[PDB]
RNA sequence: ACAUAUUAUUAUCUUAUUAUUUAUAUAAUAUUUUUUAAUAAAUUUAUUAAUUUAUAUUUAUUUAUAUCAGAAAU
RNA sequence: GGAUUAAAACUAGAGUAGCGAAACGGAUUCGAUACCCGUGUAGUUCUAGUAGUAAACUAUGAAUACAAUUAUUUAUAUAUAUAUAUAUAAAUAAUAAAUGAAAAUGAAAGUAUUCCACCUGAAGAGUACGUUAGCAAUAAUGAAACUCAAAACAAUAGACGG
RNA sequence: GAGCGUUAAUCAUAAUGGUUUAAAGGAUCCGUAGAAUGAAUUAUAUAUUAUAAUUUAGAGUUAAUAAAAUUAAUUAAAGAAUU
RNA sequence: AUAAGAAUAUGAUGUUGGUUCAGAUUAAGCGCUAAAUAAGGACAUGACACAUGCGAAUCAUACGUUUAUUAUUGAUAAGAUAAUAAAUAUGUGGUGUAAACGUGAGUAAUUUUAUUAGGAAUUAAUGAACUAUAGAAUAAGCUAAAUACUUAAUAUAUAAAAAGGAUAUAUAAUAUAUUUAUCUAUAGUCAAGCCAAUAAUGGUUUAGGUAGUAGGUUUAUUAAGAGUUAAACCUAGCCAACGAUCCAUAAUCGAUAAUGAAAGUUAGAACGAUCACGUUGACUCUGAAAUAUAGUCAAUAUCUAUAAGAUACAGCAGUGAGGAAUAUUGGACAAUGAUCGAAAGAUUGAUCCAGUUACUUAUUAGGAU
């Protein structure tokens, strides 16, 4: 049948119809007694000038074409060459986009910082008029501005208590909640195994159909799956 | 799209039918002639011979 | 340096021959075509030599391109 | 392919104490274009460049896996009845095995794997010619003929040593 | 041995090699090609290769903690001595 | 599967390292020497120049031409006609020389070689010349005549042909029969064109090369693809340090020869395959195929007939030259082939034999006492 190889598409968009395929072929050097392989580019026709550079093609023997054209395309094996030329015109319109978005959200920060050097009122300051009008009963009407520029528009003890919460303060205690529930799980999971008996009960308790006759490992994974959906699930 | 100008497919082997090739190479007489002369006589025997061959 | 021989090349010069392509002929031949003499046969027809007519096939000269080779330069 | 690359050298502009090619003198010597002494120019210095060469040496390309000990430091860690002790790495020193022409190497010059550079008698010769690069000195690349049966390394025993 | 010798030639006769010290490590590193070499498991295939999925022992990224004050470039200073 | 080393360093030792030797061989030469026979080889050099003779002819059953005899005709013999037997290849025709033979100049590959269970454009109304089968073979002209040539007729969009001769018999030139030729068609056989992949010496102190160059489109040309050639218009490519381009050198190869344990290396004389060439260059004609050992023109050399002439030994033998060196100006067509012829036969320096030469191989070249 017509003579076909395997190659890479190394050349395209410079001769118009033609591509560079790269064919690579098994040989015996006799000298250095080892099976190499021989590298050699063919021009290839291309019709539908289909093939993108980075392609993996499949090109057949036809009639002399030209000088030096004596194949044609005949398959693509895989398309990368036609994938790259698609990523890259949506990586431009993609990162524009972002960097749009992320140029308004550095001027607006800008301008909150700008117009808070505006304000020469400080947290200190207002933390000390929340706390002397609250422990003397003045009410000046500073206060509904300084209700204003916090929004605490009531004035307690337990409101200032409020406007000096760190975020530090939330992440301790959802690592405790993290801690807990891997110890909680390891923990059950520990005894369930430990007690045979209790094991078994454990999966018909949760749905499991003749848990006994299952394997270590066939069943570990259920004990695993069930104590890891009764103490997440039900948190 | 195959190359303009070129067969996409391989030409269709020729298939021989050996019956149609002895009815074309050898076919036989079609009348039984009269082959009083020595040549003719001569001729058909080695026409007969070469076919049978 | 150089004096030699050999080969190659060319925006050059000359060029046999050939191919291809131009223009021309009161060009030749055949046929057609228009007439015209001479001759012949018969009692219009044929032939030959001319002229007119187109057609095909050649010829001479001519235009252009390429070309063995030689010259010059490298 | 690229970059960096001692000393000397070169192109400009500064600097110039000391040192110091050369040069001119003083000695030494049979002679002394030397060793020693004097006066001491370039250079040695700085700034901006050129150039890409050294015994540019561990005369030992890089990477990975692996193999028997000791000593000594260093680092990290651990412990305590708190200052040592116990661990794991690195470096260095001396070694087993192994390798080697041997001298020796010793975690490689061992056991293996991968990649690069390089060599094929001496002399001629890192020369000639050409080419490339540089302001230049030069640098890179780099032969052949002729001639010879030499030539070289480690080690051994001597002889000799101002 | 009806040849023998000699000259001219061919093949064989050590790489089942080497490069600290004998010819031979590139001044050094960076890195391109390499038709150079190169991890793990499983499944396919047309099979020491290809593809896919999965993995972290090579190679990297960022932190945390501890440690160290050297090497480049630049700027600003000090010192003994010499003439 | 078959793998050996030796001499030479050094005061001595070990090692590095070259050099040389032991073996086989030749397209051999030379020196000395030499018996017969059988077989295999023989200008590697100047693709230098060549005296002389040969190497391609054959057909009379294609057409003409020339005799003799007999018969008939011709009232005197010049001629004619037919039969018979001869002659003619200095007239017109046919077939044969694209092979074979010789040589290795050119050729490093758009061309050449080798290989592949390769390919298409998906190769002509090509048969070259045999086989099988079927059909056809007509009319004029031109020549002295024809199987010469020309123009027509009819034969698979349809296109595209031809030829008679010999011998008998019967007729009144014609017809049959036999024989040998001509033309067409279909298939077979033999045999052609084109393309791809892979391999094919040295120098980069030849590093850049290319400009129809790389690709696209269209026409011309061809049986047929393609910048293969020619014309037009576009794109800016293509090759290259795994060596481009350039230069030098060389015919290539094997189930051939030499050598080695082998991988290999060498040769390419001899046997065989392939290519190129026939003093040099180009072009054209015929043809399926030729830049043909043809033709045309030119170049170089020679010759005689002095013409827009002939010849070119790389066919055989042979000569001069060059060289260290390579043979008979032989016999035969008996054999195997080739060409011509219907046959009888003719031709054949193909070929087969012999000669010369230890160039190679082999056998023999007296045994017992
Ligand atoms: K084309
Ligand atoms: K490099
Ligand atoms: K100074
Ligand atoms: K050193
Ligand atoms: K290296
Ligand atoms: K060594
Ligand atoms: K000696
Ligand atoms: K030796
Ligand atoms: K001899
Ligand atoms: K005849
Ligand atoms: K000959
Ligand atoms: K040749
Ligand atoms: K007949
Ligand atoms: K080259
Ligand atoms: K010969
Ligand atoms: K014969
Ligand atoms: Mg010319
Ligand atoms: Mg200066
Ligand atoms: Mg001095
Ligand atoms: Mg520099
Ligand atoms: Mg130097
Ligand atoms: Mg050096
Ligand atoms: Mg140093
Ligand atoms: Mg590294
Ligand atoms: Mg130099
Ligand atoms: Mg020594
Ligand atoms: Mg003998
Ligand atoms: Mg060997
Ligand atoms: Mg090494
Ligand atoms: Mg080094
Ligand atoms: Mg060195
Ligand atoms: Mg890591
Ligand atoms: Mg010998
Ligand atoms: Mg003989
Ligand atoms: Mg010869
Ligand atoms: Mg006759
Ligand atoms: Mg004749
Ligand atoms: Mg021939
Ligand atoms: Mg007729
Ligand atoms: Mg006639
Ligand atoms: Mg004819
Ligand atoms: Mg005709
Ligand atoms: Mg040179
Ligand atoms: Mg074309
Ligand atoms: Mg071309
Ligand atoms: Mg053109
Ligand atoms: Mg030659
Ligand atoms: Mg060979
Ligand atoms: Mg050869
Ligand atoms: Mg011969
Ligand atoms: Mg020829
Ligand atoms: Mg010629
Ligand atoms: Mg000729
Ligand atoms: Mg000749
Ligand atoms: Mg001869
Ligand atoms: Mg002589
Ligand atoms: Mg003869």
Sequence with gaps: ARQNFLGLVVSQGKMQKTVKVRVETKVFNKKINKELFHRRDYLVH???????????????????????????????????????????????????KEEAQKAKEFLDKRSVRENKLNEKT??????????????????????????????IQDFSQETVRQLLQLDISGLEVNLEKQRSLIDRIQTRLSELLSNDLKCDQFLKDHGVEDPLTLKKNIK?????????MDMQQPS | KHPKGSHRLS???????????????????????????????????KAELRRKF
């Design chain 1, 220 to 228: 570990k994974n259920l004990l695993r799956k069930h104590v890891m």
């Design chain 1, 46 to 96: 291309d019709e539908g000038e289909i093939s993108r550079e980075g392609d993996l093609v499949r090109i057949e023997a036809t009639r002399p074409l030209s000088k030096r054209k004596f194949f044609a395309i005949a398959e693509i094996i895989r398309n990368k060459g036609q994938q790259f030329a698609l990523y890259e015109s949506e990586a431009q319109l993609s990162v524009a």
């Design chain 2, 11 to 45: 030409p269709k082997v020729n298939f021989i039918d050996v019956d149609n090739l002895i009815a074309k190479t050898v076919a036989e007489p079609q009348s039984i002639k009269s082959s009083n002369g020595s040549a003719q006589k001569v001729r058909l025997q």
């Design chain 1, 122 to 151: 400080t947290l200190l300051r207002d933390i000390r008029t929340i706390q002397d009008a609250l422990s003397s009963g003045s009410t000046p009407k500073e206060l509904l501005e300084i209700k204003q520029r916090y929004g």
